[model samples]
Target: TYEEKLAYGLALDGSVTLNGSKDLKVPKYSLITITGENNKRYRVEMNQRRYSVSKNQVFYFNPAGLYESHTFKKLSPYIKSNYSTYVEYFNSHLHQKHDKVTETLRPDKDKKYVVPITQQPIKMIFGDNDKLSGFVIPMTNKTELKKTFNITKDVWITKSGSGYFIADMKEEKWIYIEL
Candidate 1:
């Protein structure tokens, strides 16, 4: 019942986000509307974690019906946190809803989930349009560790790909273009 697990996995993040991104064509635009910055909107694109039956494997679902399977050990703490939360939250909710679900149940249908070496850059678009603001692209040099952002607080990505807070800036605060 892996598909059933995935069906209920939708509840961990919320019904809206799950159903919204479940479509194969549309990319889920998660908009952040800050006070006074209502005219400008920011959308984040990242690998969304999913529940897995395999211990070493971690699943990430894309809006394109594509999925990424990576070894959990190789991931950054940021991604690790995502994986952990998905497993923890989804499993608890699963047990709450379904009594003694069998792990041995196989998938009911065949589907095409993919794994690719390269992916399109995480995009930041402007105002529901394709206008590019900036993006955090994956590094070509795989030796470098990915930067981790604080989950406790909200942060903005600058052109340099560094995390920053709006209130901390003095001079470029007005002129700054946040991605």
Candidate 2:
């Protein structure tokens, strides 16, 4: 596992240090804290978990952990099965929800805002209404976000198991999928 972390690392220490959110959504290392039998490693605490990571092996990390890119690993099954999973994700993480994205992303066919796609294209079908809608990274230099539904801001998408949505990146709110 350490070797695999090397793939995600590019530092002199030859260590793999990644970040999590303050709420522990993204793994974080508090410089003020110290851990390890030798007291030489940094305390990387997260999700009621802890790790010993060296200084050089580190990533500043984004709110969504790291807003690098989103990959749709796999869906447990079809949309219906995925729907229930999604509903639960939002409900459980409601405490973490914010008014950051009050605007619902909608598409306007007549309006052309074509661009390349950098982030994964996510299609969200609202449960209450039959309205199909979604959003992406919005304005990546060459990526296409809204071909019609105008946009701005970046909502980093993270993959758990089935559902994908926002979490309180600044606090302890992770909508993890359960088996």
Candidate 3:
């Protein structure tokens, strides 16, 4: 299920992040601390737990629901990675866990998945949080191949809310994965 797969995605980059929405949903009862887009940072008790992060900060629940955080926006964004990278990263762990028990029966959920993700060096794609819909893969925003990476195809763009996978139309492993 994309929604279930999205559970492993983290705040890999960017700061327009608001509401601490990207944090993996914790178990029904858990403790958490969050820093909203505003300056308010504090511990919380909700059915869902989270991380306190932004353009300069990032945090994740490493072993389920824990307060894990750090700072960024200093090192080059290109040098490190993006949310799709993290989604793929985090997805691996969950994938193994599920495989251990549900080995034979393929999951019948639309949310189960994998993909490479997309990124840019200098220009991050912009959007209207109100209208852009999240897909199992990246949103349709793009950058020219010649102008950006000198590759053969345009790069698709996405955000944490844009589901949790990105298709690499040119890359074999991810090129054929479907919803």
Candidate 4:
């Protein structure tokens, strides 16, 4: 039962790392401390229990063993059944959740803005896919305002301004990005 509990928790929380050669190894009892570029740190502990392992160990987690409060209930059953299937299902769910959270926390559509290259005399070099490439040449005699904009990759900018304004794009409000 303890092993089952541990396996359930591992299935819910554990992650696999792909090496340079594309080999996947399940992380065992890892203590991860993530540090952002801004010097902020987040601590996460994984699989604290030392579950017993046989030559070919197969773990099964009773559906009841998982906490109902956790959001991973949908994945518990698959995880208990098989490790490989569980890994794939869990990763797919993670990716979907990530996309949903990203879309939800993204800046409001109306707030998305882009700089005008014509009137402002700014020249933007496009990549092979017509994406803004390297440098944006500003032909305006006036000092160009330095600012950051948040836009969907394919969204077209019809108008230009000194800078784009996006509300609630900071870390405090956009916590989903960290997950």
TM-score of each: 0.20, 0.20, 0.21, 0.14
- Candidates in order have lDDT scores of 0.21, 0.27, 0.26, 0.22
Question: Per-residue lDDT for 115-150 in model 1, tens only?
Answer: 111222222222112222211222222223323322
Candidate 4: tens digits of C-alpha lDDT, residues 1-179: 21111112111123334222233344321212111111221111222222122211211222223221222232223112332233332233222332242242232231111112333222122212222221122111111111222233221121112211111211111000101
Q: Candidate 4 versus the native: TM-score?
A: 0.14
User: Compared with the true structure, what per-residue lDDT tens digits does model 2 show for residues 71-166?
Assistant: 332322212233334544423422221221122232322111111112223222121121111221112221233222232333223544333433
Query: Candidate 1 — which residues are off by over 4 angstroms?
Result: 1-26, 29-31, 36-124, 128-130, 139-143, 146-179
Error of 1 at 23 (Å): 16
Superposed by TM-score, candidate 1 places the C-alpha of residue 92 at a distance from the truth, in angstroms, of 47
Q: Rank the candidates by lDDT, best first.
A: 2, 3, 4, 1
lDDT of candidate model 3 versus the reference: 0.26
- Candidate 2: residue pairs that collide: 20-26, 20-27, 21-26, 23-171, 23-172, 115-144, 116-143, 116-144, 117-144
Off by over 4 Å in 2: 1-40, 61-139, 142-179
Model 4 is weakest, by summed lDDT over 10 consecutive residues, at: 169-178
Residue 73, model 4, lDDT = 35
Tell me the lDDT of model 1 at 57.
Answer: 17
